[PDB]
C-alpha cells in the first residue's frame, strides 16, 4: 500500500501541491526552490500512496544543511528539518514516524552531531527527541512613554533601504551568529529570499525599511493590520552600543505609538528605560528544537562555563547509551560506560540543556531528569549555562 | 505651607481618604487597620496642608516591619513600603521626595538592612534606589488539552474548604517562605484577612476553594467575568511532588476551559506536561523592588553560588560607598575601602541583582552596571544566582 | 480504597462541598435541599475515599423522580440524572461508570421505563445510553425592524408582577406540559424556587416581569451586561393565538433593541413577521437526553403517527434485546423474538428518536442506526414523527 | 417620466454600473458576461428615466432560464430572478412593483411553474408571492476536538488541485443536483466561472483545494481574516461513504482549529461525531425562495410521500385559485373547483411548503395557512415532506 | 555637524526615502512629484547630516503656494506647509524649530499674509504660531432608520462614474471654494491625483461611485473592512437644495446599514430627519490649522459681521505687534499703535479666531485671550464670527 522513499523529480508537482495545502504561508514554490539548494542529494524523503507511475505524494519531509552556534562560540554542522507534512487522508497511519526514523538514520549515517527544527505545533516532537532549545520573546514598546536611562549609551544610526545595503548587512549578520548561541549561517539564497521581502506588496505588507549601523541592523515595517504599530522584523546588533543606538531610533519613530520585535528573554532594552514595563511581554514561545544525536559528539563539542570547578558524573540518555561525564576548565570528554548512573533523562531534555535555555534544576524539578544529588544538580546547571544569553535566528 | 510629620490618630480619618481615593482596592478601612499593627510606632509619616487645628492631610506614606527570605535561606528584618499616596491636588511639590527621604532616615536609623516595596507603576522608584527585583509571570493553561508527561510525578490532594484548614495552610507557607528567596513571613493578623476573603460576595469575587496536599495547597476560584476560568489566587508547593499532584488536581477541573496562576518564570509546570506551549505566559511583570538601605550588612548576609571559585573585587555604588567584596564558599565578606572601583552600579541596580532575579551581565550589557573585565562580570554572574528561584509572597 | 454507597445524612456537607466545587450555578444549598425532596429514598449515590469514620467524598450522583410528557399526550415516570459529579482529584478512576452503573440499576429495578439528563458536554453520556433528545433553539429578534404580519392573529395581554400571579402561571403551565412532548410536571416545590429568582438582586439579576394572557404567559428581565436586551426566560403558550399576543406584547417592549429567547426549532415566531430574518437563529444545542430503560415498555407507551400504514419490522437495540415492532394505528406492539434483525441502533440513537426530535434517516446516513430497507427507513421516519413539536421544560 | 422596457445593447453600460452600485460581489463585469449567456431573449426589463437617446437607467431586473430539482427526482423549468435593483435616486416610487409584475407576465406566459430567487433581505419578496423554500445552515467544526463514533463508516479521498479535475467535479455535481431537491444544472458557463476562482488573488482569497472521492466532493480554502479557519465553499456527496470520508479528510487538516461550511439543517455530520456539539451551528438564513407561477402545474409535477393515505381537499391560494387536491400513492391530481375551501393561503406559503422545507403545521400556528381540520394539516404535512432533505445549490 | 539648505534635484532621493519612512500614506512619489508643482522655486528646506558630496537628508520641510477662501468671500494667497519630517535618528536636536524658522522667513518675505497646516499631532504647532482654524465632524447615519422631514427640500441626482463627469466636478467645487471659508483652490494636477483614486484596488480600496447633481456632488465608496458602511469622501454643494436631495439618494442606498462622512460641525443634515439622533457624531478633530504671518494684513482682508456696531481696541500679539483695531461695517482698519493694549492673546490664537471656528469668549475663559472688558468680548465675538459656517478642504 504505502511506500516510503526519495522522493523524484517526478514527484516535485505532488510535494508543493501538499506543501501548499499544510503550510499557509508556503506559495510561493519559487521560495521553495531557493531552500530546495540547502537539501543534501538524499535529505529528502516521500510517503506515496500505492505503486504504479507517479503514485500520489501523501507524506514528505527533508532536512537542509545548517550550520549552527553553540556556547563556546562553535559551530556545529546541523541537520535542520522542514516541510515536514502528512496529508489530511493519511493522518494516523504512522507516516510521520516512518518518515523521522529514515531521515534521523540518514542524518546519523551522514555524521551530523546535531539535528534541528522550528515546531508547528508543541506536542509532537518531544516524542522523537527533539527538546526546545531558545525561547522566543516578544516585547512590544509603548514609545510614547519611553526614555531612554540616563547610564544608556549614547548620530551613529542611518535610514536606510534595505535593498542597497547588502553587503552592510551580510557582513554584520555573519559576525553576529559566529558570537551568539542560536546563530545560523545565513546563505546566499536566503539573502536573495529575504532581501526581495522588503518591497511592499499591494493586499499584502507594507514597505520594510532599515536602521543601519556600523556594528547592527533593524529591519522593520509597519503593520498591515494597525498603521500605529512598528514591526521590527530583525535586530542584529554585535556590541551593546549599536543595540542602543538601533532603539533609541526606533524609539524615535514619532509617527508609532508600538514597536514590536520578536526577541530573547534577556533582551536588555528594558533595562535602557526609565521605566522598565514599557518594555512589555506580550507573547512567549519555544524557538528552535534541538535533537542531539551523537551524545559525546554534541558534549565534547561545545564550551561549558568556566565557574564550575572539574567535576565527574555518569549520565544516561534513555535508549542514548551511558557515559562518563567530566566537565572542567570550560571543556567536556564525554567517554562510554557501564558504571551505575548519577543522572538520566531522555534525550529531547538534553538538547533543551544544550544551548542553555533550560536549567538543569527547572527540568529536574518537573522530574524529566532524575539526579542523585542536589549538588550535581547545581553543578550541571551552572556549567551548562551561557555567558552570551541563547537568541533565535531565522525560522526555517 | 506644607508642614511633614509623624500622622497623629486625630489625622487617620484624613488618610482613610486619600487612600480610598488613591487606591481602588482600598476599601475597607477595617483592612487597613490590620495592616497598621504591622506599622510600627514611627513608621508612618503624613503630609499636612498648612498649619492650624487638623489642617488636611495630603501626602502620606509609612513602612511595614517585614521579615524577607534571601537566598542561602537567610532571613532579613525589611521595611516594607506602602500606603504612599499624594494629594491630587499636591502632585509636582516634592511631597514623594520629602517623604520617602524622611522614611529612609528612619528605616536606616532602625537598623534595617533593607527596604521592599511593590510598584504601582514603573517609573517611579528607580530614583529613591529602588530595583525590580522579583518577576511575576502569569500562565494560562487550556486544561483541554493537558495530558502530564509519563515522566510527571504521581490520590494525595484533598478538595477543601478554605476557612476549615487554617493550621495545615499556615505550616505550609511558614515552611515555603523559610526556603525560597522573596519569602515573607505572613503573620496572624495577614492570614485573618486572607482567610475573610475566600467567601463568596454578590457583586463581587465567587467563593474560594482549596485543594490540599501535606507537602503544599493551591486557592481557586472562578472567575467572575469568565466562567470557564479558574483563577488560582496561590499556590504554595514545598516539595516537587506537591507541586506536581496540585497541578494534576487543578488540571482536573473539568468544568474548566482554562486555569491561570501568577507564578515565577522557573515554575517547572510547562514540563510536566507533554506539550509545553498549553502553559502559555500571558503576562509578565515586576514584583518585589528593593532598595539596599545598608550595602555591606546586605552583601555579607545572604548567600552566595558555591560553584564559583573565590574572587575579589571592588565595587562602587554611586553615592552609597565604595567597597572591597569578597566572595568564596558560598560566602561574602564586604570592607571599606579607597581602591579603585572594578565595577559601579546605582543602588537600585544592587537590589535587583540581590535576590538573583536579574544577571549582572543583563544589567552590563544596558551599561547601568560598569565593569572592568568580563571576567568579573561571569563571576558576579555565578556568584549572586540563587539555587532556588526567586518568588513572590504576598503583595503589600 | 474507594467504596460506592448511599450517602448518609453526615455525607451531606461533603456532597456540597462537591457540588460546589463542580457546579458554578451551584449555591444555594438551601436550593439544593428543594430538589432534594423530589429524590427517592434511595435514589443518590456517593463515592467515598478509603474507609472510616467520616471518609471525604470525592463522587456523587442522583436522580429524581419525574414525569416526562411523550408524543400522544402521554405521560412517563422518568428517572432525572443530576447532581452528577466527580472529584477533580479523582477524574479517570471509573468512578463515573460505577456510579452511573449502579443508578442505573436502581432506575431499571423500580420500574422507570426511561431515565433523562441535561448535560454538561457532549461527549459524556453517549456511552450510558442517553441520546439528545430535545434540541435548544435560542432566537433573537431585533425588535426595532419588526412588523407583524397581516395574517397574525390580533388588548387581552397583562404586564404583571410574576410573585403576585402564581396560581394562573402553575395552571397554564400544567395544561402546557400534557401536551407538548418534552413536559415535564413542576412540583410545588419548583414553583417556590422559580418564583423567588424574580426578585432583583444587587450585583446580580435586575427583576423579573410577566405578560400574562388567559392561556399563556412569558417571564422576562432585561440583560445585567447589556441593557437594551430583554431576556426571556420562560414562555408558555397553551394556543396560537396566545403565542402570537405575547409576542406582540414583547416586541412592544419600546425600550428594548433585542429580545432573545431559549425555545425550539419549531417555534412559529419567525411567521409572524413580515421579515422572518429578525427571528434570528443565534445558538443551537441539544438539551434533554434520554435513557430508554425499557425498550418494548417505551415503545408501546408512545403514540405514533397515523398516517403511515400498519407495517412489521425486526428491531435490534445493541446490547438491550431483539424485538418484533408492530406499528399501526398510531399504537405499537413490540415482542421479544430471534427472527432476524431488518433494524440495528445502539441505545441512545433510540432515545434520541424517541421524541421525533431527529429522523431516523439522518441517523441512518450517519451510519449510527443500520436498517435493510429504505422503505423501512421513511415509515420508521413518519411514524416516529410528532404531531405536536418537541419543547423542552426546566434544565434539572 | 419613467418607462419600462427591454434593454438595448446600448443600455448595458448603464446596467453594469447600476449593478456595480448595488452588489458589492459585481464587479467583475465580465463575470456578468457569463450569467447573460442564461437570461432568455425577453428576459430582461430596464427602467429608463425619461425619454430621449440613451435615458440613463435607473431600475433593472432579469430572469435566467434554470432546472430545479423538486422532491421524488423531478426536474422543472424554473425563472431564475437575479440582478434586481433600483437606482438609490429612485427608491419609493413603484419601480420595483412594475419590474416584477412585468417580469412574472413574461414568465407565465412563457410556462415556468415555478420562479426563484436568492433574497439581499428577507422582507422584501413575499409581497410578490415568493417564499422561502430552503434554509442555509453554517456548522462551524471545532476540529481539535472531534473523533469519529465507531459505527461512523471508514484512503479512498485524494487532497487535489480543483483545476485539474473538471470533469471528475461535473459528473459528480450533476449526479448529485438530480438527487436532491433544491439541486440546480449547472452549466457549463458557470462552471468557467467557478473554476477560475480557485486561484489565489493577491489581497483577496487564498487558493483553493479540493478533496475528491469517486462519490464527492469538497472545495475549501484557509480564511483570509483568520488563518486556523478553513472555509468549505461546497461539499457535494452522492452517498453516505463520500460524505463521511469527505468528512474525516476535513476533519484531518490539522494545520486548522475550526473547518466552517454552509449547509443544511439535516446534514448528518453532527452524528459523525462522539461530541455532537462539536458541529456548532453558527448561522442560519433563508436560501432559495420560490414563487409558484403555476398552482395546479407545480402541485401535479412534485412527488408527494408514499407513507399518507390516499386523501382529497380543497386548496384556495389567495389571488391565485381554488383547486380540489387529491393526493394519494405519492402523486397529485390538482383541478379548478368553485366548491368550499378546506385551506387557504398565500402564494408565497406554498413555495415555503413546496420543497418540504416548512411544515404546514408550523405555517398554520403562525395563522398564515388557515384550515378546517387538524387531520388535514397532519395529512398536508406529511404528503408535503420530502424523503431526501432539500439542500442549496449555488446562489444566482 | 548640520547643515540647512534648499535642496537640490540630487536630494530627492533622500527626500522620498525620509518621507516614506515618516508617512505611511506616502507611496507614491509620482503622486509626490503632482504636489511638486504647487511648491515655489525656494518654498523647499532640507536638513543635511554633515558635509560632503551627498550627504543623507535627515530633516525636509515645505509649502505649497494655495489659495484660502476667509469670512466675505475673500481669497487669500495662502502658503501650505506639508511634507514636515525630521529622521527617527534626530529626533530632540532643533531640526523642526530650524526648519519652521527658515520657512517662516521664506513666506513673510515673499508676502503671504497666512500659512496653514494639517496637524499630524496636535501638540506640535502651536509653539509655531499655528492655532486649529477649522473643525472635523465625523457623522455616521444609520439609514436603516432615517426619514426625511415632511419640511425636508424634495429625481434631480444622477448615480454616475466619477471619471466620466470631472468638469462638472470641478466647476462645482471652483463655485463651493469660493464661497465657503476655509475654500481652497483644487489646482489640475489635484483633481488628476483625486480622479485617480477612484479606481478599485485589489487589496486596497473599492471602486467609487458619484451622486451628481447640477448644485453639488457626492464621492462615495463601500469600506474595505465593513461591508454594510459607506464611506462618502467628499460632499460639495452649493445650495441647500443639493445639499438634500444628495442626502436622499445616499440615504438610499438601501445595500447599506451606516454612511459616514467627514464634515463640519453645522451640517444641517441632522434637521433634515425625523429623529435628529440618526445623524450620529462619531468623531471630532481640528481640521486646518492656521498661522497669520502679517497681523494688520489678515484682519483688514477678511469680512466681519455686520450686525455688530462699530467698535475700536488695542490688540497685542505676544511677539507679532501692537495694533489699533478699529470695526465697523463688516470692515476692519488695523493701525500700528503704543496705546495700552485692551486685549493680549499669542499669534496662535489669532488664527483660531480667524476663519470663526472658535469664539473668542471661549478662548478667553481659558485664559489664552485677556481682555479688558466683557463688553469687548462679545463684541469680538460677534464680529469674528462667519455668516457661513467654516468648512475644511482636502487635506494637504
Redesign the interface.
Known sequence: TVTLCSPTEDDWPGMF??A?????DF?GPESATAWRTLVPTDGAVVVRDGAGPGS?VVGMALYMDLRLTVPGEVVLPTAGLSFVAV?????RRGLLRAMCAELHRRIADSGYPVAALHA????IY?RFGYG?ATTLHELTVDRR?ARF?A???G?S???V?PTEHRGEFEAIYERWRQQVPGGLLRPQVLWDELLAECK?????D??S?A?LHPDGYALYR?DRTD?KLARVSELRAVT?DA??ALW???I????MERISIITHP?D??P??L?????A??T????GLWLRIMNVPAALEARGY?????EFSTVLEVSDGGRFALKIGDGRARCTPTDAAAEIEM?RDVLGSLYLGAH?A???A????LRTKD?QLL??LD?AF?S?V?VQTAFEF
Open positions: 501541491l501538499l501548499a495545502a499544510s503550510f499557509t506559495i500520489e496529508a489530511p487522508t493519511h493522518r508547528s505545533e508543541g506536542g518531544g526546545p512613554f536611562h547610564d544608556a549609551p548620530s544610526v542611518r535610514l533601504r511592499a506588496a499591494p493586499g499584502g507594507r514597505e525599511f536602521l509597519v498603521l551593546a543595540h542602543c533609541r531610533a526606533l524615535g519613530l514619532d509617527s534577556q536588555p532594552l533595562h535602557l526609565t521605566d522598565t514595563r514599557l512589555r511581554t507573547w512567549r514561545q519555544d562555563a568556566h565557574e564550575v570547578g531522555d536549567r534544576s527547572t527540568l524539578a518537573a522530574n524529566r542536589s547545581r553543578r551552572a549555562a555567558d544569553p
